[PDB]
Amino acid sequence: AELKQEWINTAIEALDKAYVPYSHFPVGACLVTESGKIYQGINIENASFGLTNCAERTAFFKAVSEGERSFTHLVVAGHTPDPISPCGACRQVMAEFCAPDMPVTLVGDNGVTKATTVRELLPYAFTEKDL
Amino acid sequence: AELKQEWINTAIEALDKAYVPYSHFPVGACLVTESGKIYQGINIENASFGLTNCAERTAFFKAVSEGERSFTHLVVAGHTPDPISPCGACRQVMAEFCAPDMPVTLVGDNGVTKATTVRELLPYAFTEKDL
Amino acid sequence: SMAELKQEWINTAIEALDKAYVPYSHFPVGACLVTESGKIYQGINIENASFGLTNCAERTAFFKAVSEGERSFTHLVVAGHTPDPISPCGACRQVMAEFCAPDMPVTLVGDNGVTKATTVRELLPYAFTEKDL
Amino acid sequence: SMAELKQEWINTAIEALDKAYVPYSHFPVGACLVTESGKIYQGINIENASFGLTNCAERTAFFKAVSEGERSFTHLVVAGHTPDPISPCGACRQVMAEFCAPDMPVTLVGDNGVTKATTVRELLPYAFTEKDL
Ligand SMILES: [Zn+2]
Ligand SMILES: [Zn+2]
Ligand SMILES: [Zn+2]
Ligand SMILES: [Zn+2]
């Protein structure tokens, strides 16, 4: 799968921009469209923890608000010894908007990475089929 | 894996008790503790859709509020032609409280079932390790 | 008396502080939701390693009650280890508006016996409802 | 004038109604969040097949703005296709309290030009804050 350095940079650079005054645990994201346009995400906490929003979802909400519907890659980065794991809530938003086989790159500290896909992160994904 | 009919019944019976005035899409859950005690869950919607709570999480919140910390099975049921899929948010709550290999049974209409586990529904799960 | 019952509901909400699952914030919140039939449901906040999946004590109480078929609520008590009475967050206030009458009383509790009397409508003015869906 | 700028923010929030991702409720909500520097951020509600993962228009606007480093907000407009001015839900009100001054004005819009003037404090009285964490 294609992986551009600007996408890695976008997700890592977001770590310094996250709004995490309660966890001090920043997460950054780079969501790529078919046209090559990049959307950066950060996690954004709330004094009521349950209203916290993840970096991956921030990037999707940005892109989707600008009318983007065709996504080709997602990079997620953390200050973690192994590649950062997206939480299950984010995996469900990725399934809403991405193809099962759309590539995902997970990044940690000191250059560690893990290559995966939407389907491998959320197998047997719930969809709108039966609503 | 052990599977008792009362657990299937508990999840299916919950379908008639769900609070789903907006989707009319009921989901039911049966969460089993080590002691054999059963906790039933229903999905519970809100006029602001984002405040909706899933049946699986309702069962965990019930059990955890009573001090339960040892879970041995989860059944989830829907009025669906294939076994109901837990959403990614629920999968993340299951990972908070359950062993990776704890069995999960998914049920649909006309007796269709799917046997899986917490780890298979949420691979490479995010944990508190690096907070 | 209504004041004596309210003291027992306050005690239930305060006991919930010891039951909370808050390994990340270490900030417990307790709730006591009271039904028309006299049954009480105790709530705790329940955190998740992914903070956004945390559930508040008030919502835990409502989800417990609603899962048992309760639809008629008469009082809600919320307690924290706070110098002033604890404030319910906006998300909880929206779940209260889903299930409770606007004039339902809510009692907020802090440390050393401090309390504040309010209602669902006072906590969430001009509340969003299902009317236009 | 402040009233003329507010009309343009209202227009931005109303245009967002056409941009919303609401394939389940078919109930669009639009937002226009205004910064101290004059920059605006448009929000839409964005639903999910699992309803609980839906994000409101107001929060979409805040998450867009905060991700670009914005921390100083001067106005928020929220619009719906509603006969009375649309009400922000409690969850959105709590995110507004995280980032906005209590006296920040909020303009609520409905169909046929109906508006309601309020503030963050009026929408979320006795707001929960970080003070005790
Ligand atoms: Zn996440
Ligand atoms: Zn779920
Ligand atoms: Zn709350
Ligand atoms: Zn909202």
Residue numbers in the entry:
A (entry chain B), B (entry chain B): 2 to 132
C (entry chain A), D (entry chain A): 0 to 132
Q: How do the authors describe this structure?
A:
As a zinc ion–dependent enzyme, CDA participates in the pyrimidine salvage pathway by converting cytidine and deoxycytidine into uridine and deoxyuridine. Bacteria extensively exhibit two forms of CDA: a long form and a short one. The former harbors two tandem CDA domains typically structured in a dimer assembly (homodimeric CDA or D-CDA), while the latter possesses a single catalytic domain arranged in a tetramer assembly (termed homotetrameric CDA or T-CDA). The CDA derived from E. faecium (EfCDA) belongs to the T-CDA form. EfCDA showed the ability to convert gemcitabine to its metabolite 2′,2′-difluorodeoxyuridine.
The full-length EfCDA protein, encompassing a singular CDA catalytic domain consisting of 132 amino acids, was purified. The structural architecture of EfCDA is composed of a five-stranded β-sheet (β1-β5) encircled by three α-helices (α1-α3). Moreover, the protein encompasses two elongated loops that function to connect α1 and β1 (loop 1), as well as β2 and α2 (loop 2), respectively. A zinc-dependent characteristic is exhibited by EfCDA, wherein the crystal structure revealed that a zinc ion was coordinated by three cysteine amino acids (C55, C88, and C91) and a water molecule. By previously elucidated crystal structures of CDAs from bacteria and yeast, the crystal structure of EfCDA also manifested the formation of a tetrameric assembly. Molecules A and B were in one asymmetric unit with an r.m.s.d. of 0.125 Å, and the complete tetramer was obtained through a symmetry-related operation. The interface area observed between molecules A and B was 1224.8 Å2, while molecules A and D measured 943.2 Å2, indicating a stable tetramer. The tetrameric structure of EfCDA is assembled through intermolecular interactions among specific residues in disparate subunits, particularly the α2-α2 and α3-α3 regions of neighboring molecules. Consequently, the enzyme's active site is encircled by specific residues, including Y23 from loop 1 on molecule C, A48 and F50 from loop 2 of molecule C, and F127 and L132 from the C-terminal loop of molecule D, which may facilitate the regulation of substrate and product ingress and egress.
